[PDB]
A paper describes a structure:
To better understand the nature of the NTD–RdRP intra-molecular interface interactions and whether they regulate the RdRP fidelity, we designed point mutations at the Y471 and E472 sites in the context of the WT NS5B and the N- and C-terminal deletion mutants. The NTD–RdRP intra-molecular interactions are fully disrupted, and the NTD is rather involved in a non-intensive three-way interaction involving two symmetry-related neighboring NS5B molecules in the crystal lattice. The effect of E472A mutation was highly consistent with AA mutation (compare lanes 4/8/14/18 to 5/9/15/19), while the effect of Y471A mutation was slightly smaller than that of the E472A and AA mutations (compare lanes 3/7/13/17 to 4/8/14/18 and 5/9/15/19).
Compared to the RdRPs of other Flaviviridae representatives such as the NS5 of the Japanese encephalitis virus (JEV) and dengue virus (DENV) in the Flavivirus genus and the NS5B of the hepatitis C virus (HCV) of the Hepacivirus genus, the pestivirus NS5B contains a unique ∼90-residue N-terminal domain (NTD) that does not have notable sequence homology to any other viral or host proteins. The NTD interacts with the palm of the RdRP core intra-molecularly with a mixture of hydrophobic and hydrogen bonding interactions. Collectively, these biochemical data indicated that the RNA synthesis fidelity of CSFV NS5B is fine-tuned by its NTD through the intra-molecular interactions with the RdRP palm.
Residue numbers in the entry: 13 to 85, 89 to 125, 131 to 531, 538 to 670
Write the structure that this text describes.
């Protein structure tokens, strides 16, 4: 009876190891009685207990009593290499951090959400009520920023199962790529400068951005590579800014705005010179060239991912997908976690970079962080979202932890995972596909195993992980599959997501037509299954055909945008005859719940398209099958290509 109460309490128990000298009893066995807990250190949902004619409620109070005894049982020396930050302190701290040093505040140092006028007025022109759309890209004030630090970052390091990381290494040895052992070397400046955003943000004490440092202070970056390579301390620090601040900029191209959306509330990032030093050396690992993390989908475009996943899904008999959903992952990365990734990096890198990886990793286990306003805190481990290693490091750490959790829950051995499951990851996001019995075992017992591995899962109904029983219930990269029907009698899947959300993201920005047409084409590649969005996209793309699209967003087109689409999607926009009736109903629901559209909106948007398309000429709106059906005119595309 009391079994769900014990299961809740066992997730707060400190992780222990296997105890062969005592009786280890589960949440079920404790609820039945005559079992008395002797300690609260949890191992695979079991704790050590003396069989002493107990009553269920009495066993529960002893186990809670022991858990609170352990919780009510410390300040930490600062590392020498971090001492330099204390000499920059100018005023006493006011972060009021309870678990990490707030040594004070350094001297001060020298963006808003607005509408995209053309995209926003096309929406208004059809009766879409913008004010009813959800708010996106919210920036936060200093006060809630510091509260977010106390809430998420001010914490002792997660305890993990003893020996967890030897096991995880055992999992890596089942997935390593031995033909690459000890081959990774640094890259040349030319190759580094190819894939980098010159507007990459400067750290607190910096003034130049990535491109400016590239142009004029390469020697400063090389001095840093040299110091680390010889094992010498550098003055490593990360800067803290709230999400969506002027300095919340991505160094590298992004598969979509979904990657800004999953960012922590607190962005923490090394200096630009330092992000450059790390990347010039660890390029092949942090940019996954080649891909050595199994299931890593970082380089897969959003319009391909679900077609790729369906092929795996179809090869199972009775497939399910279990979601990876860790609470505030970056805050759950431990020192031992980063050191596990250090050992794996050293597997693939030439020996002359091991002292480099060793010293950087050492710098990353205790990190001076400087807030926008100047407040310093000393972070113990964790991941700063802006580190170059976030995507690659979290992806491997995710894959390893999840294979281990699945393998320990199901009894499948680490070397046999590839035989009964497929895994897919993008940083902490992901899922695996497997047969239904295997997945349900992993989804019920995985919660407790993942809490003991120091990656707690977001609390749910029935203390179970989310299972998808039908393919288009998979959730990945903030999107979910939706099927479309083409006029060549094939079907395929597109990245689907709520229409209210797509409208929000498309209609706003943080601080002109060339940019909006880029956005429109960018959204048209992802959301052509959505007739509302598809038509708003074609109307915007119809604007000022003499102006060429900007380059500051995910994608843009050279030449014709309808032909560019055909090149990456594999069909013509005009050939898309049907979008999944049911899934579209699900993704349009919030439109009506929020009242962002009326009964008139779709017709008015179609009518505005037909009015433009019936007139004499060659109009992008007629690339829409239904619009062209009502105008009797077609769009004849020119040559066109898609770019990043």
């Amino acid at each position: 009876n009391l079994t769900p109460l014990f299961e809740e309490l066992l997730q707060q128990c400190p992780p222990g190891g296997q105890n062969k000298t005592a009786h280890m009893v589960s949440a079920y066995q404790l609820a039945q009685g005559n079992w008395m807990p002797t300690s609260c250190h949890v191992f695979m949902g079991t704790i050590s207990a003396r069989r002493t004619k107990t009553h269920p409620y009495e066993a529960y109070v002893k186990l809670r009593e022991l858990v609170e005894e352990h919780k009510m049982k410390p300040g930490s020396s600062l590392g020498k290499h971090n001492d330099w930050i204390i000499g920059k302190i100018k005023y006493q701290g006011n972060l009021r951090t309870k678990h990490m040093l707030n040594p004070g505040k350094v001297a001060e140092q020298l963006r808003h959400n607005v509408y995209n006028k053309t995209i926003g007025s096309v929406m208004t022109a059809t009766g879409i009520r913008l004010e009813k759309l959800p708010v996106v890209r919210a920036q936060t004030d200093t006060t809630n920023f510091h509260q977010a630090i106390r809430d998420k970052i001010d914490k002792e390091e997660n305890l993990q199962t003893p020996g967890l990381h030897k096991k995880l290494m055992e999992v890596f040895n089942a997935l390593k790529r031995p033909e690459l052992e000890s081959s990774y070397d640094a890259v040349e400046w030319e190759e580094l400068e190819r894939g980098i955003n010159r507007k990459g943000a400067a750290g607190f004490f910096e003034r130049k951005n990535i491109g400016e440092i590239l142009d004029s202070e390469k020697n400063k970056v090389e001095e840093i590579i040299d110091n680390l390579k010889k094992g010498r301390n550098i003055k490593y620090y990360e800067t803290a800014i709230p999400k969506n601040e002027k300095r919340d900029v991505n160094d590298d191209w992004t598969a979509g705005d979904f990657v800004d959306e999953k960012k922590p509330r607190v962005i923490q990032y090394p200096e630009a010179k330092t992000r450059l030093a790390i990347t010039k050396v660890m390029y092949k690992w942090v940019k996954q060239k080649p891909v050595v993390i199994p299931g890593y989908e970082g380089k897969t475009p959003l319009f391909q991912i679900f077609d790729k996943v369906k092929k795996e899904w179809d090869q199972f008999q009775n497939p399910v997908a279990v979601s990876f959903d860790t609470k505030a992952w970056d805050t759950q990365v431990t020192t031992k976690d980063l050191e596990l990734i250090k050992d794996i990096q050293k597997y693939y890198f030439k020996k002359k970079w091991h002292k480099f990886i060793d010293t950087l990793t050492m710098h990353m286990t205790e990190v001076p962080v400087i807030c926008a306003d100047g407040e310093v805190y000393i972070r113990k481990g964790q991941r700063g979202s802006g580190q170059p290693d976030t995507s690659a490091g979290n992806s491997m750490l995710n894959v390893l932890t999840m294979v281990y959790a699945f393998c320990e829950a199901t009894g499948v051995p680490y070397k046999s995972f590839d035989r009964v499951a497929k895994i897919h990851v993008c940083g902490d996001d992901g899922f695996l596909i497997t047969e239904r019995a295997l997945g349900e075992k992993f989804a019920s017992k995985g919660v407790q195993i993942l809490a003991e591995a120091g990656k707690p899962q977001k609390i749910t109904e029935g203390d179970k992980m989310k299972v998808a029983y039908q393919f288009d219930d998979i959730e990945f990269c903030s999107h979910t599959p939706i099927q479309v029907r083409w006029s060549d009698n094939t079907s395929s899947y597109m990245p689907g997501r709520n229409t209210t959300t797509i409208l929000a993201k498309m209609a706003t920005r943080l601080d002109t037509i060339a940019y909006e047409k880029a956005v429109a084409f960018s959204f048209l590649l992802m959301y052509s299954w959505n007739p509302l969005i598809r038509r708003i996209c074609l109307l915007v793309l119809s604007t000022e055909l003499q102006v060429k699209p900007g380059k500051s967003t995910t994608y843009y087109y050279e030449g014709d945008p309808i032909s560019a689409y055909k090149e990456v999607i594999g069909h013509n926009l005009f050939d898309l005859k049907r979008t999944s009736f049911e899934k579209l109903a699900k993704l349009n629901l919030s439109m009506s719940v929020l009242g962002a559209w009326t009964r008139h909106t779709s017709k008015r948007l179609l009518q505005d398209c037909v009015n433009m398309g019936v007139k004499e000429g060659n109009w992008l709106v007629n690339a829409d099958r239904l619009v062209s059906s009502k105008t009797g005119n077609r769009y004849i595309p020119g040559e066109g290509h898609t770019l990043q």
